[PDB]
Design an enzyme around this catalytic site. Structure first.
Site, PDB file in Angstrom:
ATOM      1  N   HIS A  40       0.808  -1.218   0.000  1.00 35.45           N
ATOM      2  CA  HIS A  40       0.000   0.000   0.000  1.00 35.45           C
ATOM      3  C   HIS A  40       0.840   1.267   0.000  1.00 35.45           C
ATOM      4  O   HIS A  40       0.286   2.343  -0.250  1.00 35.45           O
ATOM      5  CB  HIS A  40      -1.046  -0.092   1.083  1.00 35.45           C
ATOM      6  CG  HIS A  40      -0.617   0.426   2.385  1.00 35.45           C
ATOM      7  ND1 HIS A  40      -0.373  -0.434   3.432  1.00 35.45           N
ATOM      8  CD2 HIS A  40      -0.558   1.682   2.878  1.00 35.45           C
ATOM      9  CE1 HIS A  40      -0.083   0.306   4.489  1.00 35.45           C
ATOM     10  NE2 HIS A  40      -0.230   1.593   4.210  1.00 35.45           N
ATOM     11  N   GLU A  52      18.935   7.186   8.772  1.00 35.65           N
ATOM     12  CA  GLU A  52      18.245   8.389   9.199  1.00 35.65           C
ATOM     13  C   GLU A  52      17.919   8.342  10.682  1.00 35.65           C
ATOM     14  O   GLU A  52      17.531   7.303  11.237  1.00 35.65           O
ATOM     15  CB  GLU A  52      16.920   8.546   8.443  1.00 35.65           C
ATOM     16  CG  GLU A  52      17.105   9.032   7.015  1.00 35.65           C
ATOM     17  CD  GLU A  52      17.367  10.549   6.974  1.00 35.65           C
ATOM     18  OE1 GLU A  52      17.803  11.145   7.989  1.00 35.65           O
ATOM     19  OE2 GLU A  52      17.138  11.154   5.919  1.00 35.65           O
ATOM     20  N   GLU A  62      23.663   9.503   6.610  1.00 38.48           N
ATOM     21  CA  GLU A  62      22.631   9.027   5.716  1.00 38.48           C
ATOM     22  C   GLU A  62      23.191   8.508   4.401  1.00 38.48           C
ATOM     23  O   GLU A  62      24.245   8.919   3.940  1.00 38.48           O
ATOM     24  CB  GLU A  62      21.700  10.162   5.326  1.00 38.48           C
ATOM     25  CG  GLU A  62      20.971  10.774   6.519  1.00 38.48           C
ATOM     26  CD  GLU A  62      21.638  11.957   7.192  1.00 38.48           C
ATOM     27  OE1 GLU A  62      22.857  12.140   7.049  1.00 38.48           O
ATOM     28  OE2 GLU A  62      20.883  12.634   7.928  1.00 38.48           O
ATOM     29  N   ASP A  84      -0.073  -7.515   1.979  1.00 45.78           N
ATOM     30  CA  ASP A  84       0.427  -6.133   1.934  1.00 45.78           C
ATOM     31  C   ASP A  84       1.943  -6.120   2.128  1.00 45.78           C
ATOM     32  O   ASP A  84       2.442  -5.848   3.218  1.00 45.78           O
ATOM     33  CB  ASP A  84      -0.325  -5.263   2.933  1.00 45.78           C
ATOM     34  CG  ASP A  84      -0.048  -3.797   2.838  1.00 45.78           C
ATOM     35  OD1 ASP A  84       0.527  -3.402   1.790  1.00 45.78           O
ATOM     36  OD2 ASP A  84      -0.400  -3.073   3.838  1.00 45.78           O
ATOM     37  N   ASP A 171       0.405   2.433  19.847  1.00 43.00           N
ATOM     38  CA  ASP A 171       0.138   1.841  18.554  1.00 43.00           C
ATOM     39  C   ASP A 171       1.001   2.487  17.485  1.00 43.00           C
ATOM     40  O   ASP A 171       1.608   3.534  17.680  1.00 43.00           O
ATOM     41  CB  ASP A 171      -1.313   2.041  18.183  1.00 43.00           C
ATOM     42  CG  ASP A 171      -1.880   1.184  17.067  1.00 43.00           C
ATOM     43  OD1 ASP A 171      -1.156   0.256  16.571  1.00 43.00           O
ATOM     44  OD2 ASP A 171      -3.065   1.425  16.752  1.00 43.00           O
ATOM     45  N   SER A 172       1.132   1.800  16.345  1.00 44.47           N
ATOM     46  CA  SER A 172       1.659   2.465  15.174  1.00 44.47           C
ATOM     47  C   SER A 172       0.553   3.316  14.560  1.00 44.47           C
ATOM     48  O   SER A 172      -0.587   3.284  15.000  1.00 44.47           O
ATOM     49  CB  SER A 172       2.310   1.461  14.238  1.00 44.47           C
ATOM     50  OG  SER A 172       1.362   0.534  13.766  1.00 44.47           O
ATOM     51  N   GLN A 174      -0.493   6.318  10.951  1.00 41.83           N
ATOM     52  CA  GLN A 174      -0.258   6.785   9.592  1.00 41.83           C
ATOM     53  C   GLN A 174       1.167   7.323   9.476  1.00 41.83           C
ATOM     54  O   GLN A 174       1.580   8.094  10.326  1.00 41.83           O
ATOM     55  CB  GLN A 174      -1.245   7.915   9.270  1.00 41.83           C
ATOM     56  CG  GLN A 174      -1.599   8.045   7.793  1.00 41.83           C
ATOM     57  CD  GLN A 174      -0.669   8.910   6.959  1.00 41.83           C
ATOM     58  OE1 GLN A 174       0.402   9.367   7.394  1.00 41.83           O
ATOM     59  NE2 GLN A 174      -1.111   9.168   5.730  1.00 41.83           N
ATOM     60  N   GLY A 175       1.891   6.929   8.429  1.00 40.69           N
ATOM     61  CA  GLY A 175       3.266   7.359   8.258  1.00 40.69           C
ATOM     62  C   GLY A 175       4.255   6.302   8.733  1.00 40.69           C
ATOM     63  O   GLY A 175       5.437   6.361   8.397  1.00 40.69           O
ATOM     64  N   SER A 177       3.449   3.149   8.209  1.00 38.35           N
ATOM     65  CA  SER A 177       3.185   2.129   7.202  1.00 38.35           C
ATOM     66  C   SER A 177       4.439   1.645   6.528  1.00 38.35           C
ATOM     67  O   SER A 177       5.268   2.442   6.137  1.00 38.35           O
ATOM     68  CB  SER A 177       2.239   2.682   6.146  1.00 38.35           C
ATOM     69  OG  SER A 177       0.947   2.774   6.713  1.00 38.35           O
ATOM     70  N   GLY A 178       4.541   0.328   6.309  1.00 33.87           N
ATOM     71  CA  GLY A 178       5.707  -0.173   5.613  1.00 33.87           C
ATOM     72  C   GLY A 178       6.847  -0.524   6.533  1.00 33.87           C
ATOM     73  O   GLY A 178       7.724  -1.282   6.114  1.00 33.87           O
TER      74      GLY A 178
HETATM   75 CA   LIG Z   1      18.764  13.024   8.617  1.00 33.01          CA
END
Ligand SMILES: [Ca+2]
Length: 223
Positions: A40, A52, A62, A84, A171-172, A174-175, A177-178
């Protein structure tokens, strides 16, 4: 991540940010050329950002590498979020060091009650919007399948598991994700979905990575 803690710089060296002009999803580095994320999160034109901590400041550790190809699971269903999972190949290999390192795939599925580490740069509020610049972490247990199915009747497949707190608050979101769910030092889950964030009786739902190892290994050996 709602209700978590600041991980500390480069204590989650397999965490990546997917960037399409902005951070939009997390992912996990599984070897020097491949990242696992959620299907998704697919978009064209992904840049993978490794090493990061603060996503808005260049701190010096980085590595920014463009994706060469993205491979969505062949059975991904965007309506139910079944399967997913997506693989992203980097245009060039990452340099692995203490700040950028791969996470192992599981040989075995994780057990109910296992404490796992979930991480990301997603929203930190259950109500309202506050995005952090530094990586947040949460420890959360895997929930029994029966408590999972009870929370989301008719929506949980065998390729999903729940992790979190039925009382809510942690909880996890939005953002995130993945991003990774790591249990006993192996990647066991991918942040996938849930109803809101940190709501009572609505824990996070995660892609069950142990069901996909054969497909991941086969795909990386041919691409
Ligand atoms: Ca950075």
């Amino acid at each position: 991540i709602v209700g978590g803690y600041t991980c500390g710089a480069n204590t989650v060296p397999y965490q990546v940010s997917l960037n399409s002009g902005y951070h939009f999803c997390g992912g996990s580095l599984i070897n020097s050329q491949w990242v696992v994320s959620a299907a998704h999160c697919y978009k064209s034109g992904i840049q993978v950002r490794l090493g990061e901590d603060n996503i808005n400041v260049v701190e010096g550790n980085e590595q920014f590498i463009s994706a060469s190809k993205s491979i969505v699971h062949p059975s991904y269903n965007s309506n139910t979020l079944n399967n997913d999972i997506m693989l992203i190949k980097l245009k060039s290999a990452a340099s692995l060091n203490s700040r950028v390192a791969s996470i192992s795939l599981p040989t075995s599925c994780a057990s109910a009650g296992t404490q796992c580490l979930i991480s990301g740069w997603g929203n930190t509020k259950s109500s309202g919007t506050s995005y952090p610049d530094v990586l947040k972490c949460l420890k959360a247990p895997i929930l029994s399948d029966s408590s999972c199915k009870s929370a989301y009747p008719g929506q949980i497949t065998s390729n999903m598991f729940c992790a979190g707190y039925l009382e809510g608050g942690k909880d996890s979101c939005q953002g995130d994700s993945g991003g990774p769910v790591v249990c006993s030092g192996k990647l066991q889950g991918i942040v996938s979905w849930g109803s809101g964030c940190a709501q009572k009786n609505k824990p996070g739902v995660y892609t069950k990575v142990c069901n996909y190892v054969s497909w991941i290994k086969q795909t990386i050996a041919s691409n």
